[PDB]
Each structure stands twice: as structure tokens, then as C-alpha cells.
From Swiss-Prot:
The active site is at 232 (cysteine persulfide intermediate). This is 3-mercaptopyruvate sulfurtransferase. Keywords: Cytoplasm, Repeat, Transferase. Residues 232-238 are annotated as: Substrate specificity. SMART domains: RHOD. Its EC number is 2.8.1.2. Its main location: cytoplasm. The keyword Cytoplasm applies. GO terms for biological process: DNA protection; response to antibiotic; response to oxidative stress. Catalyzes the transfer of sulfur from 3-mercaptopyruvate to a thiol-containing acceptor to form an intramolecular disulfide releasing hydrogen sulfide and pyruvate. May be involved in the enhancement of bacterial growth inhibition by serine. InterPro entries: Rhodanese-like_dom, Rhodanese-like_dom_sf, Thiosulphate_STrfase_CS, TST/MPST-like.
Length: 262
């Protein structure tokens, strides 16, 4: 199974009404030197509305990029004019750093069909398709509160897993960050956590090949025999490991949104 779509196809459907494009680009933290929103205005796919993962996080939380309430989301999604019942196509810069997160929230919050644009934006320009400028203003889109609990685990449920190694806990952070201590656990990671740098599943704006993934996981100490939980640390890359496993058809993979009440 593949969750991506090529530019060639997206272009041949740029006008298709059952489709809607979502620009999910965003800066990596430690880069408040960027203005992702602006960039969007300066250039973006035609029809794409800005999905600001940053301004969609629960700000109440001490921890970053926390999932928002199902209603706070439904508001945002409605102003932003996104329609919960169309086939959504998500995309980011081309680094596949945040499209997975966006894709995941949209499904976690009730959108049945959601795909990611292969190669993201950079792949789009490479195919020499033009951009569109300025803010997009569509009407309010149909989108009411919905939520799929089976997508997330609690701090509690992760406590068990980690305790009796009943579920494998994966860390998407990059090696160099897995053992330092610059985020807030053992050496910065959950006890028993297996490190799987998301970057190793990415090949220019999209996931490697089934086999390439199958191998990366195997050589990282991951079996498909017990369940997998992926925790969020690098802020948002976690979703990439999720997507990569979903592509391998692994079932019930859950995202550990971080340690916060409820």
C-alpha cells in the first residue's frame, strides 16, 4: 500500500472538486528565524490552504506540538475552509518533515481519505509546475468534531508497554539527539525505547521502498510481532515512522503525543 500521490497526477487533478490540497510546510524548531506562513503566500500549489501545525497545537500544554481538542480543531478547519469529506492531499517543503503529521491529524480527526504529495513542494517545482501566490479564501468547509482514539496512547498505556516490553516503543529523533539531553527518562529517551531516525525512511520528499523500509526497521531492532508505539520528541517527525509502518501495513500503530493530562 502507498499513501502518496505524484505531482503529475495532482496536476491532472488540480481542478478536481473531490480533491483539496493542504500546505503543511513548517520550520524545524530552533529556526524561529523563518516565517512559514509568509513563504506560503510567496508561493504554493494552486488551491492549497495553509495548515499551520504550529497554530493548531494545544497551547495549554507545557510540551510542544500537542494535539488540540476535537472542537478547537473543527473551528480552525472550518474557517480555513477545509472540507472533511473530500480527498485531501497534503504536502510540505520536500523534506517530508511535517506532511506525515498533518496527514495523521486529518485522519485522526475524521477525514477518511487523505494522501501525501510525493516529493512535496520541491518535487513539484522540479516537475516545473507553477506556483500560486497570495492568501486563499474559500467558504467555510464542512467539518465537525470527530476523533479516532485508537490512534493515540496515554502516558499510562505507555507505562505498561515500557514496563513489560509488550509493545515496542520507537523514537524517531535522529541518533545525535537520542542520547544527549536537550528536550526537557533515561538519557532523554523512554526506558526501552528503540531509536529509528526518521530520516532513514526518507528519500527526497517521500518514503523509501517497501524493502528499503523493511530492512531499516529490521536492522533497528523492530519486529512486527508485538505492537508499536511511536513517541513524539523532535516535535513532529514521529508521524513519519508511523506512516512508514502504515505503508508496511502494520496494524494499530499508535502515536504517543507526549506526557500530558488526559
Amino acid at each position: 500500500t502507498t499513501w502518496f500521490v505524484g505531482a503529475d497526477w495532482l496536476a491532472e487533478h488540480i481542478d478536481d472538486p473531490e480533491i483539496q490540497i493542504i500546505d503543511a510546510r513548517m520550520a524545524s524548531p530552533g529556526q524561529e528565524d523563518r516565517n512559514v506562513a509568509q513563504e506560503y503566500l510567496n508561493g504554493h500549489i494552486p488551491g492549497a490552504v495553509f495548515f499551520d501545525i504550529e497554530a493548531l497545537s494545544d497551547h495549554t500544554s507545557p510540551l510542544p506540538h500537542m494535539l488540540p481538542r476535537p472542537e478547537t480543531f473543527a473551528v480552525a478547519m472550518r474557517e480555513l475552509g477545509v472540507n472533511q469529506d473530500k480527498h485531501l492531499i497534503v504536502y510540505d517543503e520536500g523534506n517530508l518533515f511535517s506532511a506525515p503529521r498533518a496527514w495523521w491529524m486529518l485522519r485522526t480527526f475524521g477525514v477518511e481519505k487523505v494522501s501525501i504529495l510525493g516529493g512535496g513542494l520541491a518535487g513539484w517545482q522540479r516537475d516545473d509546475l507553477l506556483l500560486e501566490e497570495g492568501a486563499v479564501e474559500l467558504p467555510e468547509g464542512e467539518f465537525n468534531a470527530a476523533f479516532n482514539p485508537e490512534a493515540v496512547v496515554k502516558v499510562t498505556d505507555v507505562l505498561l508497554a515500557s514496563h513489560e516490553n509488550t509493545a515496542q516503543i520507537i523514537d524517531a529523533r535522529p541518533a545525535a539527539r537520542f542520547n544527549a539531553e536537550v528536550d526537557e527518562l533515561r538519557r532523554g529517551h523512554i526506558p526501552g525505547a528503540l531509536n529509528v531516525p526518521w530520516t532513514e525512511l526518507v528519500r527526497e520528499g517521500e518514503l523509501k521502498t517497501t524493502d528499503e523500509l523493511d530492512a531499516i526497521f529490521f536492522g533497528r531492532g523492530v519486529s512486527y510481532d508485538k505492537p508499536i508505539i511511536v513517541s513524539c520528541g523532535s516535535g513532529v517527525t514521529a508521524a513519519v515512522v508511523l506512516l512508514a509502518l502504515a505503508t508496511l501495513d502494520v496494524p494499530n500503530v499508535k502515536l504517543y503525543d507526549g506526557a500530558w493530562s488526559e
